[PDB]
């Protein structure tokens, strides 16, 4: 605390405008997670999604043009409004179409995370994405 | 013209029609309860209790509704040793309406 003088002391925590007794410092909260534990958690989440009918498998998911209207119409035709589309190679058209829609998120096969899978109601992953995830999870 | 009867271990003197407070006796609201334990019957010429628990008559009562009493605060704490222990109590009770006394 700016200032000095010990005529007790004015910088004591009890004194007004004094320093904090246990002032916090910039720290890190990252917690280590075992790779096998993480893979097991992902497998458990995928199994739970499968058993709850919240998982939809599609042979191919493509959009002719990078227009969000077409993607929205396609999702509406399949009774989907809040989904996590998963594919292999991240097509530019699909990503551009889905960027604007807040309720729709698209990520590559390797970008799947537990929070993303759990939060979104339904998860759509293409057959190629299915194979990639199966290989990744061992 | 009244009657003295024992219900919850404490004798009550009740007149006809007037409701009286009793302990929470487990009986349905609709059903009526007969208090065969009549310790005194009072009339113009009262009949005395020659034998305890006179069986010459019975008392009918109707439980209008059950309920809990008034909130009471109890402080078991004492000695002023700077501790606080406050507990709430709400005793159960039943108001029973007694109509008709058998002599």
């Amino acid at each position: 605390v700016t200032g000095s003088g010990k005529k007790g002391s004015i910088k004591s925590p009890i004194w007004r405008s004094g320093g904090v007794t246990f002032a916090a410092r910039p720290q890190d909260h990252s917690q280590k997670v075992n790779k096998k534990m993480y893979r097991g958690a992902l497998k458990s989440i995928l199994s739970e999604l499968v058993r709850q009918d919240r998982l939809i498998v599609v042979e191919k998911f493509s959009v002719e043009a990078p227009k969000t209207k077409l993607l929205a119409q396609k999702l509406k035709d399949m009774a989907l409004e809040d989904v996590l589309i998963i594919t292999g190679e991240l097509d530019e058209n699909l990503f551009l179409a889905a960027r604007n829609l807040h309720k729709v998120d698209v990520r590559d096969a390797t970008g799947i995370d537990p929070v993303s899978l759990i939060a979104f109601d339904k998860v759509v992953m293409t057959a190629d994405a299915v194979k990639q995830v199966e290989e990744m999870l061992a | 013209m009244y009657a003295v009867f024992q219900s919850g271990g404490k004798q009550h003197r009740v007149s006809e029609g007037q409701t009286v407070r009793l302990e929470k006796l487990d009986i349905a609201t609709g059903e009526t309860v007969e208090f065969a334990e009549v310790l005194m019957i009072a009339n113009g010429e009262e009949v005395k209790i020659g034998v305890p628990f006179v069986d010459g008559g019975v008392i009918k009562a109707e439980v209008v509704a059950h309920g809990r009493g008034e909130k009471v605060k109890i402080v078991k704490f004492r000695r002023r040793k700077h501790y606080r222990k406050q507990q709430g109590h709400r005793q159960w009770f039943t108001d029973v309406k007694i109509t008709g006394i058998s002599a």
Partner: peptide, 26 residues
């Protein structure tokens, strides 16, 4: 379904914050 997730029984302990009142022990 983030709401449903809860820790396993006994895994997490709240801990004791001593010096806070008399009903908490210290």
């Amino acid at each position: 379904r983030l709401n449903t997730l809860s820790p396993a029984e006994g895994s997490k302990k709240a801990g004791k914050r001593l010096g806070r009142g008399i009903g908490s022990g210290l």
